[PDB]
Amino acid sequence: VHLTPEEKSAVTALWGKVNVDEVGGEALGRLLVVYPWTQRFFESFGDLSTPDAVMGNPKVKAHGKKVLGAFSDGLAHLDNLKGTFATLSELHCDKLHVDPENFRLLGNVLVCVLAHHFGKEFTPPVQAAYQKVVAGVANALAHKYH
């Protein structure tokens, strides 16, 4: 992912101000609610039956943190996304057989969530740069299909 070095740090900047214990869980939780067929990869998670049941589920928040961390790994190494997500790519593609359209959906709900949490500070130039980062994660995760 090629960012104008403005971009590179306008993104680092929003990400330190990210509640690391709560935004993965909201992004993961909105995926399962907005795209309900995604709950199939997560049947081991118990109660997933209403938005409120999904959003307050402890397994969702726990897993949302591990997802967000993988993203944090991504922002750190924007020049090597395919080496960072190679282990994850194999997991999501070869074992879990997740259709890669879903990678893109998650990354865009993460954008709707960052926008939710920062409002007027998540501006078009700021989105624009996150769209490239999140396209890059999805591409890198989908590498085992390419």
Partner 1 sequence: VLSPADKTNVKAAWGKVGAHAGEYGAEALERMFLSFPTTKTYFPHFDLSHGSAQVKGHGKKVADALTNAVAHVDDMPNALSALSDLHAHKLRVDPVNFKLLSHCLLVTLAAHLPAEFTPAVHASLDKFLASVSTVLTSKYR
Q: Can you give the binding site for its own copies, defined by CB under 8 A?
A: 139, 145-146
Cβ burial 104-119 (10 Å sphere, 16+ → b, else e): bbbbbbbbebbbebee
99 makes contact with partner 1 (CB under 8 A): yes
Choice from 18, 98, 111, 115 touching ligand HEM (CB under 6 A)? 98
Binding to ligand GLC (CB under 6 A) within 117-146 occurs at 135, 145
65 makes contact with ligand HEM (CB under 6 A): no
- Phi/psi for 76 (5° steps) reads -70, -45
Place of tokens 């500070």: 121
93 makes contact with ligand HEM (CB under 6 A): no
Q: How far apart are the first and last CA of the chain?
A: 17
* Annotated binding residue 116: no
94 makes contact with ligand GLC (CB under 6 A): no
